[PDB]
Structure formats: structure tokens, C-alpha cells
């Protein structure tokens, strides 16, 4: 079951699955749910993303994206094999969600190509929310045209979501991997309470989080060829970055282009080779953690029980669990 900051998340716990072999009869089931007292949706359906013959196709497309608006209760499961190209939205009042086993890939939209978002608004903000062994992936490729949007988030919260476990996800070949408060002006995300765990991040860019404001707990998560900036904290935020394996990765922990600077509790940590640094373009303040030494303790007890893998030894177990297909594994 999740850890972390999602640990009460059942989902749709045991109802019965609801098979959905595509987009539509996703979004159909949804629709017609009453909102509460536990939807399970069984996806089948099998993507060929060799049907995708050019990465710059896609953002120029309409977004497909499944919205659970102002339900609760819900399992979106994709069976083994499954694949998507559609992305998922959690938005409102929308509790108690479980979004397991999805292989999300190459998404239409640009800009509006989110895979998996939480979002606040006006109605209510997502609370208990466990996004676990999913597969998300896209390209590193900056299409003509397309502006700094060939493709948008892997795995994004904002305005205020709570109490959210990302764990056991494979993030690769994406620029822009986690957001976690969308602005400066974010204020509502202060209520923030994450946790990222034995999530693997390979071949990305950016984002790995990008922390605005509230509280977070990254550990035991295996990064490797990030290329532009790891752990981004800012705005107030403090994240607990524990018995991470870090390799070949530039920006590891860092504090950059928010008005203001996040920080960080450091412990247990694997720092491999292949780790470099560079100084922000702007004006802005920025921090790097060069040295490794924590900026602030974590204010409050986390509340919850967690077991640590070795940092070691995370490379080897992330590689084996994280993402679809695994069988859940942890």
C-alpha cells in the first residue's frame, strides 16, 4: 500500500473493476460514478507508440487528458501491458485517488500535454492521492515552433493539494518532470505535504521536483543523466532529501529563479560521479548545495512510518521496482 503523505489512500479499494479499453470509456465511467463511495477502472487498452512517427506531431494536436472533477474514490489501474496516450487530471474537490500501472506516453497537446496533474481550484483542493508504478515518457526534443512547450508535466500538483505519495514511478526521457506549485503567487501550496520515493528519473531535464512552498520528503529515489537541475526548492518550501542515489546529474539540490529561496534537510545521501553545478541566468537569489549541508531541519515530524532502503543500494532496487509492468513490486 502507499507510504508517505498519501498512506490513508484506498482508491476505489475493493469494488469490483470497471473495464475500460479506452480513453472514452475512461471518462464515460467516470462521468456517470455518483462522485463517492469507491469506483475501480481496470484500463486495457494497448497503445502502439510506433503509430507516433514524429515526436514534433504532437504538440501542435488538442490535449487528451481523463478529468476526475469533484469525485473521490477512485482506482485507475492499468492493466499489465496497458498503454496510454492520454494523460490524467485530479481537479477540486477530488479525494482519495489511486493512479497505478499507466504507461503514459509521447501526449498530444504541448503545453496542454500534462500526463498526471493535480490541481486546487475555487471548489476544493486533492487530498490523499497515490501516483504509483506508472511509466511516463515523451522527448527531450525542442520542436520547431513549439516554444519551451514541446510536451508539458510528468507528474504535477498545484494550488494547494495535500497529502500525496508519487511513488515506485518511472519518469524518462522528459523535460519537465514534477512541478509542485505552479507560481510564486502559489500561496494555497503551503498546504502542500509530499512524499517522492523510489521513483526513478532518467534522461530528463528539469523539474525533478521544482518544490513551491509547503513540505516534502524525497528519498530513496534513483536520478541519473539530468541534465539542467535535480531538486529545485523554492518559495519558502523545505523539503527532507534522504538516502537518494545521485549520478551524472547537474543542479542536484538547488534553490533557483523564485523570489525567493527554499531549503533542505540532508541525510544519508549517494552522491556517484558524474555531478556538476552551473550559477542561474538572472537576477533572482539561488543556492546550491555543493557541500551537502542541510539549510534548514524538517519543522515537524512527518507523521508517518517508512522503511529506507540502503542509499547504495537504491540504484539496483529502484531500477527493479520502479514503473508499470513490475508487478507492483516494491
Known amino acids: 500500500?502507499?507510504?508517505?503523505?498519501?498512506?490513508?489512500?484506498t482508491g476505489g479499494g475493493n469494488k469490483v473493476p470497471v473495464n475500460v479499453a479506452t480513453f472514452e470509456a475512461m471518462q464515460s465511467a467516470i462521468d456517470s460514478?455518483?462522485?463517492?463511495?469507491?469506483?475501480?477502472?481496470?484500463?486495457?487498452?494497448?497503445?502502439?507508440?510506433?503509430?507516433?512517427?514524429?515526436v514534433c506531431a504532437q504538440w501542435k494536436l488538442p490535449a487528451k487528458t481523463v478529468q476526475i472533477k469533484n469525485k473521490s474514490d477512485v482506482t485507475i489501474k492499468g492493466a499489465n501491458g496497458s498503454a496510454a496516450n492520454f494523460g490524467i487530471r485530479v481537479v477540486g474537490n477530488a479525494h482519495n485517488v489511486i493512479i497505478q500501472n499507466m504507461t503514459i506516453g509521447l501526449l498530444q497537446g504541448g503545453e496542454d500535454a500534462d500526463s498526471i496533474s493535480l490541481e486546487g481550484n475555487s471548489s476544493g483542493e486533492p487530498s490523499k492521492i497515490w501516483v504509483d508504478h506508472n511509466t511516463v515518457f515523451a522527448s527531450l526534443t525542442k520542436c520547431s515552433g513549439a516554444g519551451d512547450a514541446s510536451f508539458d508535466g510528468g507528474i504535477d500538483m498545484k494550488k494547494?493539494?495535500?497529502?500525496?505519495?508519487?511513488?515506485?514511478?518511472?519518469?524518462?526521457?522528459?523535460?519537465?518532470?514534477?512541478?509542485?506549485?505552479?507560481?510564486?503567487?502559489?500561496?494555497?501550496?503551503?498546504?502542500?505535504?509530499?512524499?517522492?520515493?523510489?521513483?526513478?528519473?532518467?534522461?530528463?531535464?528539469?523539474?525533478?521536483?521544482?518544490?513551491?512552498?509547503?513540505?516534502?520528503?524525497?528519498?530513496?529515489?534513483?536520478?541519473?543523466?539530468?541534465?539542467?537541475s535535480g531538486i529545485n526548492v523554492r518559495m519558502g518550501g523545505i523539503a527532507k532529501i534522504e538516502s537518494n542515489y545521485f549520478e551524472n546529474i547537474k543542479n542536484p539540490v538547488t534553490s533557483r529563479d523564485s523570489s525567493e529561496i527554499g531549503y533542505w534537510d540532508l541525510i544519508n545521501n549517494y552522491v556517484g560521479s558524474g555531478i556538476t553545478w552551473g550559477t542561474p541566468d538572472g537576477s533572482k537569489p539561488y543556492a546550491n548545495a555543493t557541500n551537502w549541508i542541510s539549510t534548514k531541519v524538517f519543522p515537524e515530524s512527518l507523521g508517518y512510518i517508512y522503511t529506507v532502503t540502503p542509499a547504495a543500494q537504491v540504484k539496483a532496487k529502484v531500477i527493479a521496482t520502479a514503473g508499470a509492468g513490475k508487478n507492483l513490486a516494491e
Not at 500500500?1 to 489512500?9: E, I, L
Not at 463517492?36 to 502502439?48: A, Q, R
Open 33 to 54: 460514478y455518483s462522485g463517492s463511495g469507491g469506483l475501480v477502472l481496470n484500463y486495457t487498452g494497448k497503445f502502439d507508440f510506433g503509430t507516433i512517427k514524429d
Open 1 to 9: 500500500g502507499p507510504v508517505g503523505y498519501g498512506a490513508a489512500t
Open 160 to 228: 494547494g493539494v495535500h497529502h500525496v505519495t508519487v511513488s515506485y514511478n518511472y519518469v524518462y526521457n522528459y523535460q519537465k518532470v514534477a512541478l509542485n506549485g505552479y507560481s510564486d503567487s502559489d500561496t494555497k501550496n503551503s498546504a502542500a505535504r509530499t512524499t517522492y520515493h523510489h521513483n526513478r528519473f532518467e534522461n530528463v531535464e528539469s523539474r525533478v521536483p521544482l518544490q513551491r512552498f509547503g513540505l516534502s520528503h524525497i528519498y530513496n529515489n534513483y536520478f541519473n543523466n539530468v541534465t539542467t
